[PDB]
Design an enzyme around this catalytic site. Structure first.
Site, PDB file in Angstrom:
ATOM      1  N   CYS A   1       3.072   6.248   6.863  1.00 59.57           N
ATOM      2  CA  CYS A   1       1.546   5.949   7.446  1.00 59.57           C
ATOM      3  C   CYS A   1       2.027   4.949   8.556  1.00 59.57           C
ATOM      4  CB  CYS A   1       0.792   5.481   6.565  1.00 59.57           C
ATOM      5  SG  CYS A   1       1.116   3.982   5.590  1.00 59.57           S
TER       6      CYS A   1
ATOM      7  N   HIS B   1      -1.435   0.724   2.732  1.00 61.46           N
ATOM      8  CA  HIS B   1      -1.357   1.838   3.488  1.00 61.46           C
ATOM      9  C   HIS B   1      -2.000   1.618   4.780  1.00 61.46           C
ATOM     10  CE1 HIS B   1      -5.169   2.715   1.561  1.00 61.46           C
ATOM     11  NE2 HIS B   1      -5.784   3.181   2.754  1.00 61.46           N
TER      12      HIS B   1
END
Ligand SMILES: [Zn+2]
EC number: 3.4.19.12
Lengths: 311, 75
Positions: A14, A258
């Site tokens: 990510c 994330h």
């Protein structure tokens, strides 16, 4: 004619995806990348993979979907021992690595001066240090591709950026070795922006080291980011910038989390979370300023801001 | 020669260094002043993150240069 596609996550990737999306929505960067694809040779490197990926996004048959950046991620892992793993990583480290890697490829090709990476992201600071004992001023110019700015609770990036360039007085342990005085003296030090870049990438220093605890924490402070910024040059007197993308770190701490990205496209906002793309209202962007209260908790915090100059 | 490091709070510190100092050596000196382990430090200068195993003269870092110290938010 636009295309909104998420990117597949290939094992804690990510951090790469979020930066790739921000960069796709930096128009001059996307255009130079696509022009590169248009002329490119058969030899594969990180830039040719990035160009293939951008071209793939730009030429999808449908307006919405998901693309796997499989070749780009393989190549990334092959080239950089730092990223040759399946661990979580920092987006800013990845941004700077990618830009300099591309720039090195471009320079090497010129030799069979500035590359287009520098045309887009490079600015220049002038550091001035002034000895308070003899009043001698020493000036030193230093380039950058992005500015890492320090943060505080309940402020704006305009203030963070101004503090970056404010005069600091150096005393005691930080005294300056003056070559006229041939000895350490009190001094004033100021880093001014000599030349503003076409795209100003701002990295927020959302971390604090606790000497006694022997670790650091994430700073989930409220730091407002305006949609436009007026910035000034030392010697065009000023330049207006518009916000085009925000890389956002989600997590209560610095070791895990994330990444997602919000971007501006044709006057509305999109959120890209790996394979998911959603429209979001202008107002929901305020969530990414950081936390007001309960600040050691999970935050979705703006971390890298991309400002595009109007001219 | 004396260089500068812009630290995590924006406070500027001085370091005494030689051109032959490795980036690792520089991080050890920052650790002596700030307490941050070298393996957590990232140093940016002239638009580039400085690599372990190289020297200040490899990057043409001269007196009065300002290194930018940052850490990481992993994701
Ligand atoms: Zn002096």
């Amino acid at each position: 004619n636009e295309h909104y596609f998420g990117l597949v996550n290939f094992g804690n990737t990510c951090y790469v995806n979020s930066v790739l999306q921000a960069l796709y929505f930096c128009r001059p960067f996307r255009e130079n990348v696509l022009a590169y694809k248009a002329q490119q040779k058969k030899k594969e490197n990180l830039l040719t993979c990035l160009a293939d990926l951008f071209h793939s996004i730009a030429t999808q048959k449908k307006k919405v979907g998901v693309i796997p950046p499989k070749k780009f991620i393989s190549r990334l892992r092959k080239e950089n021992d730092l990223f040759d793993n399946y661990m979580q990583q920092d987006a800013h480290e990845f941004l700077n690595y990618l830009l300099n890697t591309i720039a090195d490829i471009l320079q090497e090709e010129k030799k069979q001066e500035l590359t287009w990476v520098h045309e887009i992201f490079q600015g220049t600071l002038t550091n001035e240090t002034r000895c308070l004992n003899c009043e001698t001023v020493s000036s030193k110019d230093e380039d950058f591709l992005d500015l890492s700015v320090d943060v505080e609770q309940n402020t704006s990036i305009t203030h963070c950026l101004r503090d970056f360039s404010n005069t600091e007085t150096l005393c005691s342990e930080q005294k300056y070795y003056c070559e006229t005085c041939c000895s350490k003296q009190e001094a004033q030090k100021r880093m001014r922006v000599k030349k503003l870049p076409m795209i100003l990438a701002l990295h927020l220093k959302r971390f604090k080291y606790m000497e006694q605890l022997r670790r650091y924490t994430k700073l989930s402070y409220r730091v407002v980011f305006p949609l436009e910024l007026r910035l000034f040059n030392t010697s065009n007197l000023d330049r207006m910038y518009d916000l085009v993308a925000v890389v956002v770190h989600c997590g209560s701490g610095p070791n895990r989390g994330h990444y997602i990205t919000i971007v501006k496209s044709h006057g509305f906002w999109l959120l890209f979370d790996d394979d998911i793309v959603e429209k979001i209202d202008a107002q929901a962007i305020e969530e990414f300023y950081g936390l007001t209260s309960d600040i050691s908790k999970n935050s979705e915090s703006g971390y890298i801001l991309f400002y595009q100059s109007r001219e | 020669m004396q260089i500068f490091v812009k630290t995590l709070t924006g406070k500027t510190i001085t370091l005494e260094v030689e051109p032959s100092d490795t980036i690792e050596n520089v991080k050890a000196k920052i650790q002596d002043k700030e307490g941050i382990p070298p393996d957590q430090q990232r140093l940016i200068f002239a638009g580039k993150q400085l690599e372990d195993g190289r020297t200040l003269s490899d990057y043409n870092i001269q007196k009065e240069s300002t290194l930018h110290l940052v850490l990481r938010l992993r994701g």
